[PDB]
């Protein structure tokens, strides 16, 4: 794999640096590396494909090196290097495509796509140029086990869950108390609703708590915590628990009092924020506990007192919301994001070459059902395919 990243990086730097008119003093090292790559490849015959619609290609390498005599580079050199680079480029692309489509529970880290098992041999070790990228660095670190980390912008660590929970219910759905939530991608929008506005509850208060349990620990996360969740603040017609009937929901938004956010790590509290909205930080956390209170306004005006009567009809239902977005984060494991394309590359290769569903990844590689059960086999295969996808992307965008 390291040699694959080396191939990709030196072919990239050759398409970039080796141009017409440039100066051999700037590309001497790249040229020696290219010639060594050639010297090591020549004599080997590779096969790619054999799963789905991947065409079974055979690669045979017999090229000639790049002379070191010139001072400035001319077109009779650039052209030979381009005809030598395009072949290697489509070779690496087809190898990455044959590697993004194979899986295993037994040693998922182990190279599949047996051409890559062949490039993993010891004679191909001469091709290593630099393992500098974040994914390849974290790969080498995992092999030589050390505290790894990827830096994510708006990470997709929450599986899509748009669900409610009723702690007081009747068949007519006319005096309710509960909490609704939409946890999707990098956002959590929660809303605790009481139809009574806490008229009978003790001290005119009603407690709400929302607990999220991430499947992989995060670190140095920058978060934005706002009140008044937008998407649970308008009229709604929601279903029942079993899909039998439907109930109405006419919210009227109040502000969370005694709001308290706790970021925990294996039940041990780590960060605690009391009544602080806007930009916050979480240095290490595996669990989030949001806890807020719906507090009946004791001093009310007529226009609002006419909304929260002391009897059951309750045509206006008091709500208390909270939005929580994770803008950036750092994670020891590999996830999906909003900035990076590796997941889309993988899924697109699979949708194109019609790969059957394997024993590990769910059908169509749906991130929701992929992060819902983030088994270590799935994590290993995901890191492998994302790494080779980054590799492929460094050549063919």
């Amino acid at each position: 794999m390291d040699v694959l990243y080396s191939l990709s990086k030196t072919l990239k730097d050759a398409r970039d640096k080796i141009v017409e008119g440039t100066l051999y003093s700037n590309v001497s090292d790249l040229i020696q590396q290219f010639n060594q790559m050639i010297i090591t490849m020549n004599g080997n015959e590779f096969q790619t494909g054999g799963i789905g619609n991947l065409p079974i290609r055979n690669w045979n390498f017999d090229f000639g090196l790049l002379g070191t005599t010139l001072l400035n580079l001319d077109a009779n050199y650039v052209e030979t290097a381009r005809n030598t680079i395009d072949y290697f480029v489509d070779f690496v692309d087809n190898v990455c495509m044959d590697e993004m489509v194979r899986e295993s529970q037994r040693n998922g880290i182990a190279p599949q796509s047996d051409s890559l098992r062949k490039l993993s041999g010891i004679k191909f070790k001469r091709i290593n140029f630099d393992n500098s990228s974040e994914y390849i660095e974290n790969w080498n670190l995992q092999n030589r086990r050390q505290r790894t980390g990827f830096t994510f912008h708006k990470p997709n660590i929450f599986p899509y869950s748009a669900s409610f929970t009723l702690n007081r219910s009747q068949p007519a759905h006319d005096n309710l108390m509960g909490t609704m939530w939409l946890n999707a991608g990098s956002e959590i929008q929660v809303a605790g609703f009481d139809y009574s506005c806490a008229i009978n509850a003790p001290a005119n208060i009603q407690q709400f708590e929302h607990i999220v349990q991430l499947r992989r620990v995060l670190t140095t996360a920058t978060i934005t915590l706002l009140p008044d969740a937008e998407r649970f603040s308008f009229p709604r017609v929601i279903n029942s628990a079993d899909g039998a009937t439907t109930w109405y929901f006419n919210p009227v938004i109040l502000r969370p009092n005694n709001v308290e956010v706790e970021f925990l790590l294996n039940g041990q509290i780590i960060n605690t924020y009391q009544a602080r909205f806007g930009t916050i930080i979480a240095r290490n956390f595996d669990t989030i506990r949001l806890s807020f209170q719906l507090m009946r306004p004791p001093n009310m005006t007529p226009a609002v007192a006419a909304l929260f009567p002391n009897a059951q009809p309750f045509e206006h239902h008091a709500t208390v919301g909270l939005t929580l977005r994770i803008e950036s984060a750092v994670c020891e494991s590999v996830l999906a994001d909003a900035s990076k394309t590796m997941l889309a590359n993988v899924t697109s290769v699979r949708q194109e070459y019609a790969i059957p569903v394997g024993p590990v990844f769910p059908p169509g590689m749906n991130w929701t059902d992929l992060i819902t059960n983030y088994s270590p086999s799935r994590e290993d295969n995901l890191q492998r395919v994302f790494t080779v996808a980054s590799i492929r992307s460094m050549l063919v965008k």
């Binding site: 869950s161 748009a162 669900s163 409610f164 929970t165 009723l166 702690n167 007081r168 219910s169 009747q170 068949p171 007519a172 006319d174 005096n175 509960g178 929601i238 279903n239 029942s240 628990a241 079993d242 899909g243 039998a244 009937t245 439907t246 007192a305 006419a306 009567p309 002391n310 009897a311 059951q312 009809p313």
Partner: protein, 260 residues
Amino acid sequence: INLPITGSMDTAYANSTQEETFLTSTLCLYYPTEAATEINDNSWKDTLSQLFLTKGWPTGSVYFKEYTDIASFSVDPQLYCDYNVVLMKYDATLQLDMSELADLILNEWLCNPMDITLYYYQQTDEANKWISMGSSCTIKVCPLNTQTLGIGCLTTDTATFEEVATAEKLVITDVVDGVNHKLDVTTATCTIRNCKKLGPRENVAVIQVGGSDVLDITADPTTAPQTERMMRINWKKWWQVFYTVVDYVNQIIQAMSKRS
């Protein structure tokens, strides 16, 4: 149900329970004697049943229960059916009586008994009331102070009391909540019960046959509401009313829900 129910929002809406709940439920109409009088027919019940048999209700599911007057109905109403409809004539002279009947049937009450000659009772919240039923209730009350003496009344001379009810078959009394009252009632003829008002009875549907909506169910004079299961009609005959009820029974049964 005070348990932590959980669900989702991607679940698909299932097929209509209607045309199965009709078969596994029952309906009971409560009409006035004036209806049967103006009709002057004997097989009108079988007629209405054969009509409901089109809308889906089977034969042995529909029932009719005559009642001569609103007061003779308010005297210990016994509504035991899986769906109840009550047609109610409008009368300004019977405004408070039929509003008490509404506040009694539409809502669910938890009613403890009351012994007046031995105990002195009070209200705690705004949902504790005193409902009295019987042939003719004559209720008088004396509110008391901290030291078990009367305020503007004498604990002995019943003539000093305050007369809240005067020959009413049904009364619902709300008094100042936080003070001990001594009562005098006609216990031979009327029994009184200390009731707490719980969530609404979603089994009954009142239909005011005549005038405008006057029913103030809620004792607090701020809500003045009008719920879903409180209908109004304008009438000149009764056959048209019954045909309207029949044709639009499914809306009524969507507005009521399955007491069991």
